[PDB]
Design an enzyme around this catalytic site. Sequence first.
Site, PDB file in Angstrom:
ATOM      1  N   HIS A 196       0.686  -1.240   0.124  1.00 41.04           N
ATOM      2  CA  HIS A 196       0.181   0.157  -0.061  1.00 41.04           C
ATOM      3  C   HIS A 196       0.821   1.442  -0.024  1.00 41.04           C
ATOM      4  O   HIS A 196       0.729   1.923   0.853  1.00 41.04           O
ATOM      5  CB  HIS A 196      -0.808  -0.158   1.108  1.00 41.04           C
ATOM      6  CG  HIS A 196      -1.939  -1.529   1.271  1.00 41.04           C
ATOM      7  ND1 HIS A 196      -1.573  -2.264   2.123  1.00 41.04           N
ATOM      8  CD2 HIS A 196      -3.087  -1.440   0.491  1.00 41.04           C
ATOM      9  CE1 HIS A 196      -2.953  -3.222   1.769  1.00 41.04           C
ATOM     10  NE2 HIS A 196      -3.546  -2.569   0.806  1.00 41.04           N
ATOM     11  N   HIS A 253       1.493   1.603  -5.710  1.00 36.65           N
ATOM     12  CA  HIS A 253      -0.060   1.059  -5.857  1.00 36.65           C
ATOM     13  C   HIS A 253      -0.918   1.945  -6.222  1.00 36.65           C
ATOM     14  O   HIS A 253      -1.896   1.800  -6.913  1.00 36.65           O
ATOM     15  CB  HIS A 253      -0.181   0.234  -4.684  1.00 36.65           C
ATOM     16  CG  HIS A 253      -1.612  -0.449  -4.685  1.00 36.65           C
ATOM     17  ND1 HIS A 253      -2.192  -1.308  -5.312  1.00 36.65           N
ATOM     18  CD2 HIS A 253      -2.651  -0.058  -3.714  1.00 36.65           C
ATOM     19  CE1 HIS A 253      -3.632  -1.374  -5.076  1.00 36.65           C
ATOM     20  NE2 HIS A 253      -3.868  -0.485  -4.165  1.00 36.65           N
ATOM     21  N   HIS A 265      -6.780   7.101  -2.496  1.00 34.56           N
ATOM     22  CA  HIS A 265      -7.336   5.984  -1.701  1.00 34.56           C
ATOM     23  C   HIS A 265      -6.630   5.186  -0.710  1.00 34.56           C
ATOM     24  O   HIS A 265      -7.282   4.412   0.329  1.00 34.56           O
ATOM     25  CB  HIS A 265      -7.906   5.193  -2.650  1.00 34.56           C
ATOM     26  CG  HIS A 265      -7.137   3.898  -3.213  1.00 34.56           C
ATOM     27  ND1 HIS A 265      -6.225   4.129  -4.074  1.00 34.56           N
ATOM     28  CD2 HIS A 265      -7.193   2.727  -2.599  1.00 34.56           C
ATOM     29  CE1 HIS A 265      -5.872   2.897  -4.454  1.00 34.56           C
ATOM     30  NE2 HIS A 265      -6.126   2.035  -3.530  1.00 34.56           N
ATOM     31  N   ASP A 266      -5.330   5.151  -0.612  1.00 31.47           N
ATOM     32  CA  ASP A 266      -4.628   4.446   0.668  1.00 31.47           C
ATOM     33  C   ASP A 266      -3.617   5.459   1.131  1.00 31.47           C
ATOM     34  O   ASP A 266      -2.429   4.824   1.816  1.00 31.47           O
ATOM     35  CB  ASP A 266      -3.737   3.276  -0.174  1.00 31.47           C
ATOM     36  CG  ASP A 266      -4.956   1.946  -0.258  1.00 31.47           C
ATOM     37  OD1 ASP A 266      -5.500   1.603   0.591  1.00 31.47           O
ATOM     38  OD2 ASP A 266      -4.989   1.086  -1.353  1.00 31.47           O
ATOM     39  N   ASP A 298      -8.296  -1.323  -7.851  1.00 34.50           N
ATOM     40  CA  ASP A 298      -7.563  -1.571  -6.555  1.00 34.50           C
ATOM     41  C   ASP A 298      -6.997  -2.996  -6.439  1.00 34.50           C
ATOM     42  O   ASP A 298      -6.043  -3.012  -5.689  1.00 34.50           O
ATOM     43  CB  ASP A 298      -8.563  -1.209  -5.315  1.00 34.50           C
ATOM     44  CG  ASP A 298      -7.702  -1.126  -4.084  1.00 34.50           C
ATOM     45  OD1 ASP A 298      -6.935  -0.644  -3.823  1.00 34.50           O
ATOM     46  OD2 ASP A 298      -8.267  -1.664  -3.036  1.00 34.50           O
ATOM     47  N   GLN A 357      -3.797 -16.745  -2.886  1.00 29.33           N
ATOM     48  CA  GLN A 357      -4.153 -16.271  -4.122  1.00 29.33           C
ATOM     49  C   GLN A 357      -5.227 -17.132  -4.786  1.00 29.33           C
ATOM     50  O   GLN A 357      -5.976 -16.466  -5.661  1.00 29.33           O
ATOM     51  CB  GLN A 357      -2.832 -16.526  -5.047  1.00 29.33           C
ATOM     52  CG  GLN A 357      -1.541 -15.562  -4.536  1.00 29.33           C
ATOM     53  CD  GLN A 357      -2.128 -13.947  -4.267  1.00 29.33           C
ATOM     54  OE1 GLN A 357      -2.683 -13.694  -5.520  1.00 29.33           O
ATOM     55  NE2 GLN A 357      -1.729 -13.315  -3.381  1.00 29.33           N
TER      56      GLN A 357
HETATM   57  C1  LIG Z   1      -4.642  -7.966  -5.970  1.00 26.76           C
HETATM   58  C2  LIG Z   1      -3.487  -8.287  -5.024  1.00 26.76           C
HETATM   59  C3  LIG Z   1      -2.079  -8.409  -6.060  1.00 26.76           C
HETATM   60  C4  LIG Z   1      -2.154  -9.773  -6.719  1.00 26.76           C
HETATM   61  O1  LIG Z   1      -1.712 -10.000  -7.563  1.00 26.76           O
HETATM   62  N1  LIG Z   1      -2.688 -10.746  -5.681  1.00 26.76           N
HETATM   63  N2  LIG Z   1      -2.980 -10.469  -4.467  1.00 26.76           N
HETATM   64  C5  LIG Z   1      -3.514  -9.409  -4.238  1.00 26.76           C
HETATM   65  C6  LIG Z   1      -4.275  -9.365  -2.950  1.00 26.76           C
HETATM   66  C7  LIG Z   1      -4.302 -10.613  -1.895  1.00 26.76           C
HETATM   67  C8  LIG Z   1      -5.233 -10.333  -1.008  1.00 26.76           C
HETATM   68  C9  LIG Z   1      -5.549  -9.208  -0.529  1.00 26.76           C
HETATM   69  N3  LIG Z   1      -6.543  -9.082   1.015  1.00 26.76           N
HETATM   70  C10 LIG Z   1      -6.744  -7.865   1.659  1.00 26.76           C
HETATM   71  C11 LIG Z   1      -7.595  -8.425   2.876  1.00 26.76           C
HETATM   72  C12 LIG Z   1      -8.792  -9.393   2.739  1.00 26.76           C
HETATM   73  C13 LIG Z   1      -8.278 -11.012   2.504  1.00 26.76           C
HETATM   74  C14 LIG Z   1      -7.099 -11.171   3.550  1.00 26.76           C
HETATM   75  C15 LIG Z   1      -6.757 -12.672   3.424  1.00 26.76           C
HETATM   76  C16 LIG Z   1      -7.317 -13.724   2.652  1.00 26.76           C
HETATM   77  C17 LIG Z   1      -8.444 -13.333   1.589  1.00 26.76           C
HETATM   78  I1  LIG Z   1      -9.432 -14.532   0.451  1.00 26.76           I
HETATM   79  C18 LIG Z   1      -9.134 -11.842   1.793  1.00 26.76           C
HETATM   80  C19 LIG Z   1      -8.077  -7.136   3.852  1.00 26.76           C
HETATM   81  O2  LIG Z   1      -9.057  -7.525   4.251  1.00 26.76           O
HETATM   82  C20 LIG Z   1      -7.162  -6.093   3.964  1.00 26.76           C
HETATM   83  C21 LIG Z   1      -6.189  -5.977   2.729  1.00 26.76           C
HETATM   84  C22 LIG Z   1      -6.564  -6.426   1.444  1.00 26.76           C
HETATM   85  C23 LIG Z   1      -5.374  -8.018  -1.145  1.00 26.76           C
HETATM   86  C24 LIG Z   1      -4.810  -8.181  -2.249  1.00 26.76           C
HETATM   87 MG   LIG Z   2      -7.048   0.624   0.941  1.00 21.52          MG
HETATM   88 MG   LIG Z   3      -5.390   0.095  -2.352  1.00 18.05          MG
END
Ligand SMILES: C[C@@H]1CC(=O)NN=C1c1ccc(NC2=C(Cc3cccc(I)c3)C(=O)CCC2)cc1
Ligand SMILES: [Mg+2]
Ligand SMILES: [Mg+2]
Lengths: 363, 363
Positions: free
Chosen positions: A79, A83, A148-149, A264, A315
């Site tokens: 963040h 990004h 936004h962040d 995002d 992922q």
């Molecule tokens: C999009 C990015 C970049 C990429 O390529 N892969 N992965 C990414 C990515 C992976 C996980 C998250 N998760 C975020 C979480 C939710 C979350 C956390 C763990 C498992 C799952 I299910 C969902 C939150 O609540 C707070 C920060 C954002 C955010 C982005």
């Molecule tokens: Mg954010």
């Molecule tokens: Mg963001």
Amino acid sequence: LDLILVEEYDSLIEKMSNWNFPIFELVEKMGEKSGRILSQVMYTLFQDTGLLEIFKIPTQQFMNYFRALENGYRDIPYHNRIHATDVLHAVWYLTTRPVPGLQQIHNGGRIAYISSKSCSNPDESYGCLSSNIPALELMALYVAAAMHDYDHPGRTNAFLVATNAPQAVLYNDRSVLENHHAASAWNLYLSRPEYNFLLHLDHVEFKRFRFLVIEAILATDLKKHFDFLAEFNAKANDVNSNGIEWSNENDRLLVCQVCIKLADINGPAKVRDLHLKWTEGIVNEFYEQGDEEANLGLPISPFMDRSSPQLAKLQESFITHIVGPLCNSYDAAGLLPGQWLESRRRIFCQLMHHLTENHKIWK
Amino acid sequence: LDLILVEEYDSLIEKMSNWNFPIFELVEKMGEKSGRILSQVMYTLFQDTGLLEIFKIPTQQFMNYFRALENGYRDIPYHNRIHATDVLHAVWYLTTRPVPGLQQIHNGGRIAYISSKSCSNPDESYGCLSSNIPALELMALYVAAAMHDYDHPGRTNAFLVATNAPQAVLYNDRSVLENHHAASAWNLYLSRPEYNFLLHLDHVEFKRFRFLVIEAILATDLKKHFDFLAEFNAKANDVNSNGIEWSNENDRLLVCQVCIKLADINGPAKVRDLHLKWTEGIVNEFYEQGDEEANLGLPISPFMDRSSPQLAKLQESFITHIVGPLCNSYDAAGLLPGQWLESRRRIFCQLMHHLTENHKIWK
Ligand SMILES: C[C@@H]1CC(=O)NN=C1c1ccc(NC2=C(Cc3cccc(I)c3)C(=O)CCC2)cc1
Ligand SMILES: [Mg+2]
Ligand SMILES: [Mg+2]
Ligand SMILES: C[C@@H]1CC(=O)NN=C1c1ccc(NC2=C(Cc3cccc(I)c3)C(=O)CCC2)cc1
Ligand SMILES: [Mg+2]
Ligand SMILES: [Mg+2]
Ligand SMILES: [Mg+2]
């Protein structure tokens, strides 16, 4: 430096004209000035879309603000300024590039519309959101991406909440982070006259702009991810639904909100090399929250224990449950920029393919 | 060594058992110690219900915190300690007294329920919400009535947003005041350990308690009035629905939120003498706001110009568009404590009578 000001602009514009914009190279290419990437990209884009012209935006105060905003982003793995620039490039791209089949309404007192100079619709069989969403509203969307962040600590809302962080208490545990990004960036904007780059907007215009920016920034709290998808779906994808009314204020906003939401979390819809790069960032940031959770006696959250990683589960999961359906909905609504074919399908959508490909890596 | 204590208790309880609790006489009777009216009422109601016993609440910390909370209310004409005491009295009353037709589901496990010592259901044809809503939830409702207008500046959210007050910017123009009442009051609570009267709730109970208190306080923002009313009439007053599902957490919360909304604007549903005393308070507060507005060269808000008053139109409108529909809505639900005349067939509800009568004063 005289003639180098143009070479710099034309080149960046050239590189950004790509969905898979090689943003990390730009970072490498800026070197010691890479900390000005968000402000630089903003200037380039507001100029590509003619927004400086439309709202008679003074360059000096425009750069002062975005330069100050940049330095508000922390040096954390995910963040950060990069990004933020990434999300900005995504929404700018998604709202200006040709979209197969999309119906147009109005291009260019009266309601102004922007139009990117670095791209055009091939023929009447394409269309761009920029012809359906007024300039002010898209400007609000671009500005929201940049802020936004802002001042993100690298920790989640649940973390802030679970540790009774002052910020969580201040915001009664609701969209803690998102409220802080918006409040702080607006606080920054109103703290100095030299930042007032929107001075030419009338009081009503300015008030609506503030509202829009806030609405886009708060739409990024993943906690409301499913409500938003439901609404959007109900508006254009579900049966019966009349579809999106571009003349309807609430429909435009919703679209924009969905747009920044997709931007995002765009990583997995980018070429593998880019995807794996943002993937590394979020996991490194999670481990950091995990080290702190453990130091505070708290149980390490799922996917954040470096000594017990589940990188593929993360992922695989996050793509199947959040990114996937989201792109699915946006695409099923006919809003993804792409091209006609006439493979077996008539439309080729680059992100949809990246998404599928990147999904095999972890499934 | 301590006999002059119970006399007080039984007195006040006797007086509060009346809807038209003569709260102003009690302010007089308390003379100089009146600034501690809210803390004293809290203690009395917590004994009456048995919350002190149920949650093993230590008297010392309890009084410490509610005495600190009280001094947080400014000395203004309407949004003060008294008003908070009034709202507090009204949620306790709405929740404990007899309700005609209300099925006595929890006619006596692990989940505790309170029972007011100052009344009871004459029989099966009566009921009371204290039997369908767990102790922890009603306690949250009472504590929220206590904190709901904490540190109120005597100005509207609209005024705050317009003068671009720091707090307006800090909350992104969303339920500014309400967010601040809840954020300030929880900050206070946590600021010192001698305020921790909830130390015997587990982290799960406490976390939920916090949530419920915030939900109730934020529900007092009149900006969201028609949304709550609508969202309520759905679950409790319309088509192919048998109404509320006392087993449903969300339904329970919506009931609590409508209960505190009613109690918050109870004035016109009280006896004429009480009604006018509160009316007088709100008009003087609007006039102080209007003076500042004029002083700032801002346009004076409707009904807030002491030189061009519209007191009757104000009350007649507010009763017709806000209080009235909120009660009619709450009544159709069948949650109002009332009495059958001559049982079954028909029900006489005191608050509806007052409301109708007070309306005739201004229409
Ligand atoms: C999009 C990015 C970049 C990429 O390529 N892969 N992965 C990414 C990515 C992976 C996980 C998250 N998760 C975020 C979480 C939710 C979350 C956390 C763990 C498992 C799952 I299910 C969902 C939150 O609540 C707070 C920060 C954002 C955010 C982005
Ligand atoms: Mg954010
Ligand atoms: Mg963001
Ligand atoms: C319930 C009290 C006491 C009484 O007996 N009569 N009148 C009362 C009363 C009357 C008006 C308001 N109005 C409030 C307003 C909304 C509002 C303002 C002007 C006209 C109308 I239409 C509605 C706001 O947005 C911010 C503070 C609360 C609040 C209380
Ligand atoms: Mg450690
Ligand atoms: Mg209030
Ligand atoms: Mg109030």
